[PDB]
């Protein structure tokens, strides 16, 4: 029919039409002219050629570039047959029938807000005033402020305060769906509950950025609303944010506290050897709070307090026991949020992020779900608050070069010179010299790194009530690398010791290694050699995603159908499981 192949007008009397009209005109003309030549009984060769040209016109209409060469349009581009309005990434089955466009939606730029609770998100005023329009019309007409629809249109556009009151009424208890593309796995879209703010950006909780894989440096996010009454209950009971906190790939929790809260939890619960209020006794966590806040005691200075802890070892009900424990002041501040079912030895340690994750998991095992949600949120709040209150900056005095670094490199160079001398006298072969040189450089690397880390970790020497003691350090780089916020040992080694040997594009290992680091600055061709590996990494990261996405598609398309249908199949024996520690250890 026509409307399946329109002929759209232009600005200036021009017409843009699909290629189908062109492909049809050619066949119509060939048909008419061949009928003419057939009536008059023209000599044979005219009939032969005319019939063959009719053949070509038809079987170019069916699908263009198959039999011979494709019949191009004006622009040296092939035409669009019927059989390629169904194929490809642009056809019907994939572009227009499995994924629609959708209205009642919007998109914008994300940014953080830490005053939320993890079943909430922010909406700018005007996005929410554009999405929820008909609900507003209904409420106005029901209240009797507007008689007809046009009155409601104008009252909404002029933005009179009653509109803001009604809008605040409507969105209550009405979850929306937030999405971020690409959506690799089922935790990619979740159902939040709005809070209206002013601005232009969709605020979002911190803890649920690990599931989306979102960073706040320019990402974008899309918002949909559910209309009907069943879909609203589905967005509440199946895909809310507080209902799925175990990943379906493997039951490991998915709300690990990320990168800044952990440093606060790690700076509260640690011990100095001298601070103040050394060795006086308290009566509970509350007097510890009063003492730390009034400025009579330091946030971490070892003390002994009295605490009351609850175990529910009985038949499902709690029993209380009290005692004098030997702890700092920071841990006695934490004990105010652990929820009445946990032993006190959860807190007596310096809380790197493994300890925090165990803390949450143990709460989940014993007390169920709701206490875990409340407790996780309180951890986020207190971590932020007591991490800002310390002040923790990084300055060029923190990158500490080991003192014994001239000797190591000088010795290594002497050794390589001797091996070169022995080679030039012919005693040793070609490859043997190469191998011995790389081995000696690797050994020098290792002992430089070990000297560095023996200088960073435990070198604060401080004295109290006597002569001298050594304790673990308070060097900002070391706290950011030990607790687990950011970094690791290898990358501190990049910043302070030698930065290793570098490889050339072929894959070989170049002979003379880098020797300077990022505090001393490095030379010209040392930089020009780092560039090799840097570009190889960058070029690989950009050309995985193609066949990764392709593989995911093929898998989803094979495993599509299967669903769990019956209760018990009644079959007999299956397979057998044994450990696979084989080769080496476990």
């Amino acid at each position: 029919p026509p409307d399946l192949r329109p002929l759209v007008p232009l600005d200036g009397g021009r017409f843009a039409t699909s290629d189908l009209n062109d492909l049809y005109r050619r066949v119509i003309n060939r048909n008419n002219r061949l009928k003419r030549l057939l009536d008059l009984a023209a000599p044979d060769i005219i009939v032969r050629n005319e019939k063959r040209m009719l053949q070509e016109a038809v079987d170019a209409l069916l699908d263009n570039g198959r039999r011979g060469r494709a019949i191009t349009g004006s622009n040296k581009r092939p035409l669009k047959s019927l059989a390629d309005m169904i194929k490809g990434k642009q056809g019907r089955f994939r572009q227009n029938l499995l994924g629609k466009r959708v209205d009642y939606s919007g998109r914008s730029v994300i940014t953080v807000g830490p005053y939320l609770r993890l079943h909430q998100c922010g909406l700018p005023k005007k996005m929410a005033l554009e999405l929820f329009k008909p609900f507003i019309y209904g409420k106005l007409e029901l209240r009797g402020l507007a008689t007809t629809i046009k009155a409601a249109k104008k009252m909404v556009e002029r933005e009179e305060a009653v509109v803001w009151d009604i809008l605040d009424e409507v969105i209550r208890e009405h979850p929306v769906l937030l999405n971020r593309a690409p959506t690799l796995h089922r935790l990619g879209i979740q159902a939040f509950e709005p809070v209206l703010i002013e601005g232009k950006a969709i605020q979002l909780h911190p803890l649920v950025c690990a599931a989306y894989n979102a960073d706040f440096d320019g990402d974008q996010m899309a918002v949909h609303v559910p209309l009907t009454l069943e879909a609203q209950l589905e967005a509440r009971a199946l895909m809310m944010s507080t209902n799925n906190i175990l990943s379906p790939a493997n039951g490991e929790p998915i709300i690990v506290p990320s990168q800044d809260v952990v440093l606060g939890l790690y700076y509260m619960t640690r011990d100095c050897v001298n601070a103040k209020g050394e060795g006086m006794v308290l009566t509970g966590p509350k007097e510890a709070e009063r003492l730390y806040r009034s400025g009579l005691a330091s946030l971490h200075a070892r003390v002994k307090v009295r605490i009351t802890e609850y175990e529910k070892d009985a038949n499902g009900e709690l029993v209380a026991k009290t005692s004098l424990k030997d702890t700092t002041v920071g841990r006695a501040i934490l004990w105010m949020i652990v929820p009445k079912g946990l032993p006190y030895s959860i807190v007596n340690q310096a809380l790197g992020k493994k300890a925090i994750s165990k803390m949450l998991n143990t709460c989940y095992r014993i007390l169920g779900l709701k206490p875990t949600v409340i407790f996780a949120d309180q951890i986020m709040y207190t971590g932020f608050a007591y991490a800002a209150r310390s002040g923790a900056s990084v300055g060029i005095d923190d990158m500490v070069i080991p003192e014994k670094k001239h000797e190591i490199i000088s010795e290594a160079e002497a050794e390589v010179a001797e091996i070169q001398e022995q080679f030039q006298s012919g005693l040793v072969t070609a490859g043997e010299r190469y191998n011995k040189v790389i081995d000696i450089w690797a050994a020098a690397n290792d002992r430089v790194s070990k000297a560095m880390m023996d200088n960073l970790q435990t070198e604060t020497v401080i004295n109290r009530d006597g002569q001298e003691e050594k304790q673990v350090s308070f060097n900002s780089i070391y706290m950011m690398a030990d607790s687990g916020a950011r970094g690791s040992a290898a990358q501190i080694r990049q910043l302070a010791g030698m930065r290793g040997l570098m490889a050339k594009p072929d894959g070989s290992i170049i002979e003379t290694p880098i020797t300077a680091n990022f505090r001393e600055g490095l030379n010209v061709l040392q930089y020009f050699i780092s560039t090799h590996g840097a570009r190889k990494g960058l070029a690989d990261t950009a050309l995985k995603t193609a066949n990764s996405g392709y593989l995911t598609r093929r898998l989803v398309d094979v495993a599509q159908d299967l669903v769990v249908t019956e209760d018990d199949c009644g079959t007999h024996e299956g397979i057998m499981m044994t450990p696979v520690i084989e080769g080496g250890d476990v």
């Binding site: 629609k100 800044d260 501190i492 061709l525 570009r535 990494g537």
Partner: protein, 1340 residues
């Protein structure tokens, strides 16, 4: 020190003396085009090659011909600015000189019949503006260089395509500039193969027979044989001693009269030694030695003529009798061994079905053109015009050089066409590389890739146009009259114009020029792409091309490239790189002579760099002598090591020719990682020019060159002293020495106020000099969009103090204060363009008028009589800009309504309206309205007003020019009159006009009065004719596309400022997205009252290792302390001597810096204005790899009384307590970026719908809904939700009845759903059942 240097001197910390200074940043376009159009006399470059390559054309019969002579370019009708306002191309006409001579057919050379001589107009060619950009239909446009594989020969080896074999396969290739390729190849069992243009594989040697030369001659050329004699009894073989080598003996080798070598005995070196000491070559051998051999030369029965054995064929022992009896006393054979001389040619022969030339040509001919009969002419023509015609195959000037060099000939140049010897040599060296001699080439070498730029591309396109014309010239010349045929008639200028105007504006490489910065220009013009016509594609290119090669050192930047799909395909040219004469890249170096680094500089290519040994810039030169330390670091043959003090040959020039210009502007580049520096150098090009620009406190010395050479600031043309300065023009008066004696010597600069940049930002210029102060040639007189006193200043520098703060800077987020928004130091201007056109419909013409049917009087206050908005009225989305009505059908009527419509009196042709309106969501303040009209349409009132205004300004400018000209000239014409006596009291008493009438003396002064009158007359004639010319050019009607009557064009201008969600970033690659705007109180305040302005996050340094920003912060805080100290000295009004002493103390601080500024020379007012300019903070410089060190930066910090460590005590804003630990504080320099929020947020509830498939449109421009791709559908199936995607598949997208009834229910208070069928499904049903397939769905 120039006159813009005594204003504000920037301190250098560099320590290496400089030998070569950076060249003109963008020479490559200018030189390429400039040698495209120049008139070369003899050495064809440019257009003259293109003509002289189609050197005269004769007829099919040869009865006449026309001969090309010369050419010239007219002058353009319009200068650039008019050509950009108007909306037309900027071009020049091409006028060619031609002669047609007619030579008679009766006489053999009766040339004296006719000689017609004239000029011919054909085509128009665009020109290059002064900077390097074309204008094409009014939008400035830039075309990018290309980097492709050099034409020539090429060897390599695939790693066993049939990899099951596991054996490498070699091959060779010939590729010319214009023609058809040629490939030679092996097969998994060693049989040579050829192929032409990737056709079917053919067994080789078929070319060898196709040269019409058979086994004998050519395959004697190929092998050189082994000599035998049949001495009437037996066989003797001649043994050259150096033949039996690495071999084994089958019987006891001996001589005619001695025994030499035993049986079963390999021929060691001593055996050859003995044989050559014995001087014996002829040796009797058993005839079994011939059992196994092969013949070499064809031997026949000399009586009958029967071939005993064709050349290069097998033999036997009865054939020994045959050869001896026929009269052959000698036998030539083959010295064959697969390890040395394998029978690859031999097997190739005994697989070829062929014997003579005719069979080979026939087979090829029906191969390439199957079907058509192979007549003798057809076969010969196909094989000649394929490889051996100068018309259809040409290598190059460069291809021949590369060819002859790769085969180790001697003579560089020769013929441009293939021949026999070349193919023979390619085959021989390919077999040679097979046997173990030599080795393959590689592709990424910058000695096999060539750059091709504007001049060459345009030359090729215009040659294509020329040959197309030559066709029709040959056609028409042969037939018609000759004696009355003027040449101008028989050309057509259409094809040249079509080809050229298609390439300059439709090709793969003509692009817009990103006008965000000065960086964006002079990085978009120095760019080297690898795509386009004749190159790769984003999917073909593998992993070998995208990688860094050891030959990029000093020719192409290694840390500058995009991040998307095309990583290594486009990359920017380095700082000092030239281009050779052929096209390969070149780099400077300094010559070393006997340990002394001399001063003369040599440029080196990409292949000669490998022979020598090169030092490095960081090698500590020992004060004019040789190098200090023994084992100087060097590099050669593409590897680095330690060498002596005498072996070195060259030392590279400057410490920074390895990097580009985009990435030599970031300080402390040497400290931070590679890919973080990539992100920094790649988002420094996206800043936005703010209101008032501010210099950077820490730069890398190369600000000034980029700001000047980018051609965006108005530079002085000739020296002088400023005459008149205004906000929109400056008039300068030249010195006497620089004035050539024609004119009066005034220059006039018209600055360009607010204007659109084709990324929708604001371009404007500000005068930079006061009134009455001198100006020397080369200075700057007007800062550009984003400069500051001639220094590139690209963003603003703020006090940052970074530490974690209540999680409002969790991941990369920022936290700006709220007096960064009060001071307006990040707002920007954005202007926008809207247009309205009126055409001629079939019914009739449109109109532009204020009487629009069916509009309330309210919206028509803001239109004048002519129906166009006022200037200055501020509009908001939805209003009217231009009032237009479109006539439509006229139906006929009855007399009664005629009476009525004549009383009420309103209309003849009830008429639609289609006026222009502001698309919703836009606002602003109109600032400029332009009106274009044809030549023949009556000019409405407002266009008349506008043109009259513009004439008024033009006449003011012209009279001012000619009037200050004649102010000098009238000082002259007042001085000259004074001669002839004095009338001192009456001289100025009477009006100056009455100076031609007073007392006259005969002997000379009649000539004086006569010349008064005369020069007045010519002056007035020049004035009037000049003004008439200008008025004619202004009032001139315009030209429009067919069917258009007149078009108006309206601008708008908004003002955007900071709010949450909006992006920022530093120079080192630390992005971020503002998170909160925080009152003044809450900002942490140091011990003295002053708060902070940004609060970054310290958890972002250790994990990405961009340690640049910490040191940059410390220098910031060091460089502001001195500014504060000068401010204190200067408000308190101290004295001059103290300022002199302190400032001189600040410029002598480094270890061994090269800059030494002595200001005991400066005069007192100059010192005072310098101290005025530094009171905001002393600027500092730090070249890229020769930076400042921690000792020097700490000496600075200790000069201004600041803590040496770098970090201070910060209190808190809300509670008044002290932060537990010290905190860093300093001055970062950070940038806007134009990923604003106001261009991203979008929201839809109901709107348009498509036409063919009935589901909502897409994109913000046309108010569409988002997309729910199949990945989200899988996500929503995994959960188990089934109602939700039924909702998203039918009643929000396609089901028509469903959506209307859903809206009804929602507004009615009932939340339910009645679904149907997505009607694009039944669209699919009809598309399938249209093919002849009966898709149709059963019923219940």
């Amino acid at each position: 020190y120039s006159y813009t240097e005594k204003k504000r001197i920037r301190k250098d910390f560099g320590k290496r003396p400089q030998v070569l200074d950076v060249p003109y940043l963008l020479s490559i376009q200018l030189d390429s085009f400039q040698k495209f159009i120049e008139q070369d006399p003899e050495g064809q470059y440019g257009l003259e090659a293109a003509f002289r390559s189609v050197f005269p054309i004769q007829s099919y019969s040869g009865n006449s011909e026309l001969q090309y002579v010369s050419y010239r370019l007219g002058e353009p009708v319009f200068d650039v600015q008019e050509c950009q306002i108007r909306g037309v191309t900027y071009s020049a006409p091409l006028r060619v000189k031609l002669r047609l001579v007619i030579y008679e057919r009766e006489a053999p050379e009766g040339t004296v019949k006719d000689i017609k001589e004239q000029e011919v107009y054909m085509g128009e060619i665009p020109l290059m503006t002064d900077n390097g950009t074309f204008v094409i239909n009014g939008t400035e446009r830039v075309i990018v260089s290309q980097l492709h594989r050099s034409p020539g020969v090429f060897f390599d080896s695939d790693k066993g395509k049939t990899h099951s074999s596991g054996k490498v396969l070699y091959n060779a290739r010939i590729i010319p500039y214009r023609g058809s390729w040629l490939d030679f190849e092996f097969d998994p069992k060693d049989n040579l193969f050829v192929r032409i243009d990737r056709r079917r594989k053919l067994p080789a040697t078929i070319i060898l027979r196709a040269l019409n030369y058979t086994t004998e001659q050519i395959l004697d050329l190929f092998f050189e044989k082994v000599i035998f004699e049949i001495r009437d009894n037996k066989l003797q073989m001649e043994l050259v001693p150096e033949r039996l080598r690495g071999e084994t003996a089958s019987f006891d080798i001996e001589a005619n009269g001695k025994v030499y070598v035993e049986k079963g005995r390999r021929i060691t070196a001593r055996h050859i030694r003995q044989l050559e000491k014995d001087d014996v070559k002829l040796i009797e051998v058993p005839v079994e030695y011939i059992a196994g051999k092969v013949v070499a030369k064809d031997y026949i029965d000399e009586s009958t003529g029967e071939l005993i054995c064709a050349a290069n064929m097998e033999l036997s022992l009865d054939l020994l009798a045959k050869l001896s009896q026929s009269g052959h006393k000698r036998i030539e054979t083959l010295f064959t061994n697969d390890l040395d001389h394998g029978p690859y040619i031999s097997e190739t022969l005994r697989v070829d079905p062929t014997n003579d030339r005719l069979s080979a040509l026939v087979e090829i001919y029906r191969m390439m053109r199957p079907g058509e009969p192979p007549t003798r002419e057809a076969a010969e023509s196909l094989f000649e015009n394929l490889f051996f015609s100068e018309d259809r195959y040409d290598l190059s000037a460069v291809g021949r050089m590369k060819f002859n060099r790769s085969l180790l000939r001697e003579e560089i140049e020769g013929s441009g066409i293939l021949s026999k010897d070349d193919i023979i040599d390619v085959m021989k060296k390919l077999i040679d590389i097979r046997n173990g001699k030599g080795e393959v080439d590689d592709i990424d070498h910058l000695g096999n890739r060539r750059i091709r730029s504007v001049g060459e591309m345009a030359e090729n396109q215009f040659r294509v146009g020329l040959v197309r014309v030559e066709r029709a010239v040959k056609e028409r010349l042969s037939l018609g009259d000759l004696d009355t045929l003027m040449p101008q008639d028989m050309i057509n200028a259409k094809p040249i114009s079509a080809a050229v105007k298609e390439f300059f504006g439709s090709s793969q490489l003509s692009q817009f020029m990103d006008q965000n910065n000065p960086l964006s220009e002079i990085t978009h013009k120095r760019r080297i792409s690898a795509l386009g016509p004749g190159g790769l594609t984003r999917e073909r290119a593998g992993f070998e091309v995208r990688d860094v090669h050891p030959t990029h050192y000093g020719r192409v930047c290694p840390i500058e490239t995009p991040e998307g799909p095309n990583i290594g395909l486009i990359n920017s040219l380095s700082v000092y790189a030239q281009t050779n004469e052929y096209g390969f890249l070149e780099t400077p170096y300094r010559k070393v002579t006997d340990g002394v680094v001399t001063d003369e500089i040599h440029y080196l290519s990409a292949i000669e760099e490998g022979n020598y040994v090169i030092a490095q810039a960081n090698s500590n030169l020992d004060e004019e002598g040789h190098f200090v330390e023994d084992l100087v670091t060097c590099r050669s043959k593409g590897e680095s090591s330690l060498f002596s003090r005498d072996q070195v040959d060259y030392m590279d020039v400057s410490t920074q020719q390895v990097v580009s210009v985009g990435a030599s502007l970031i300080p402390f580049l040497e400290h931070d990682d590679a890919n973080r520096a990539l992100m920094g150098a790649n988002m420094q090009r996206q800043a936005v020019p703010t209101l008032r620009a501010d210099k950077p406190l820490v730069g890398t010395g190369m600000e000034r060159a980029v700001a000047v050479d980018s051609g965006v600031t108005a530079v002085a043309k000739r020296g002088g002293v400023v005459q008149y300065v205004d906000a929109s023009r400056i008039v300068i008066k030249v010195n006497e020495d620089e004035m050539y004696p024609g004119e009066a010597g005034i220059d006039i600069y018209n600055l360009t106020k607010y204007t659109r940049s084709n990324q929708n930002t604001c371009i404007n210029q500000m005068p930079c000099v006061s009134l009455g102060e001198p100006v020397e040639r080369g200075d700057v007189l007007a800062d550009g969009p984003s400069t500051d006193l001639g220094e590139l200043a690209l963003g603003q520098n703020m006090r940052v103090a970074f530490m974690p703060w209540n999680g409002y800077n969790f991941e990369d987020s920022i936290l700006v204060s709220e007096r960064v928004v009060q001071e307006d130091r990040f707002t920007t201007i954005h202007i926008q363009e809207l247009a309205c056109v009126s055409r001629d419909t079939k019914l009739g013409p449109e109109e532009i008028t204020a009487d629009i049917p069916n509009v309330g009087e309210a919206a028509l206050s803001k239109l004048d009589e002519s129906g166009i908005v006022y200037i200055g009225a501020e509009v908001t989305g939805g209003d009217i800009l231009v009032g237009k009505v479109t006539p439509k059908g006229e139906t006929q009527l009855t007399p009664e309504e005629k009476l009525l419509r004549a009383i009420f009196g309103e209309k003849a042709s009830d008429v639609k309206d289609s006026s222009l309106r502001v698309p919703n969501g836009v606002s602003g303040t109109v600032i400029d309205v332009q009106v274009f009209t044809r030549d023949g349409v009556e000019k409405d009132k407002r266009a008349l007003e506008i043109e009259e205004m513009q004439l008024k300004q033009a006449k003011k400018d012209l009279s001012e020019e000619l009037q200050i000209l004649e102010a000098g000239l009238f000082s002259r014409i007042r001085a000259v009159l004074v001669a002839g006596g004095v009338e001192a009291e009456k001289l100025d008493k009477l009006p100056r006009d009455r100076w031609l009438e007073l007392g006259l003396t005969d002997e000379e002064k009649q000539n004086q009065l006569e010349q008064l009158a005369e020069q007045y007359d010519e002056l007035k004639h020049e004035f009037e004719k000049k003004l008439e010319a200008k008025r004619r050019k202004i009032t001139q009607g315009d030209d429009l596309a067919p069917g258009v009557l007149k078009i108006v064009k309206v601008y708008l201008a908004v003002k955007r400022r900071i709010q949450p969600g909006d992006k920022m970033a530093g120079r080192h690659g630390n992005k971020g997205v503002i998170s909160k705007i925080n009152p003044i109180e809450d900002m942490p305040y140091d011990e003295n009252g002053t708060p902070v302005d940004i609060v970054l996050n310290p958890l972002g340094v250790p994990s990405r290792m961009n340690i640049g920003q910490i040191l940059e912060t410390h220098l910031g805080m060091a460089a502001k302390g001195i500014g504060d100290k000068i401010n204190a000295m200067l408000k308190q009004q101290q004295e001059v001597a103290k300022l002199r002493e302190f400032i001189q103390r600040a410029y002598d601080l480094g270890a061994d810096v090269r800059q030494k500024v002595d200001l005991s020379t400066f005069s007192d007012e100059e010192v005072m204005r310098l101290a005025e300019n530094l009171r905001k903070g002393m600027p500092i410089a730090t070249p890229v790899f020769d930076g400042a060190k921690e000792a020097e930066i700490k000496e600075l910090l200790k000069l201004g009384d600041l803590p040496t460590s770098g970090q201070i005590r910060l209190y808190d804003g809300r509670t008044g307590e002290q932060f537990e630990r010290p905190v860093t504080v300093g001055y970062m320099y950070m940038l806007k970026l134009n990923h604003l929020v106001d261009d991203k947020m979008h929201a839809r509830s109901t709107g348009s719908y498509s036409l063919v498939t009935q589901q909502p449109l897409g994109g913000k421009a046309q108010f569409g809904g988002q997309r729910f791709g199949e990945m989200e559908v899988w996500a929503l199936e995994a959960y188990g939700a089934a109602y939700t995607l039924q909702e998203m598949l039918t009643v929000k997208s396609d089901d028509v009845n469903g959506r209307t009834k859903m809206y009804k229910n929602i507004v009615d208070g009932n939340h339910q759903m009645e679904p149907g069928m997505p009607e694009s499904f039944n669209v699919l049903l009809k598309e399938i059942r249209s093919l002849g397939i009966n898709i149709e769905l059963e019923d219940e």
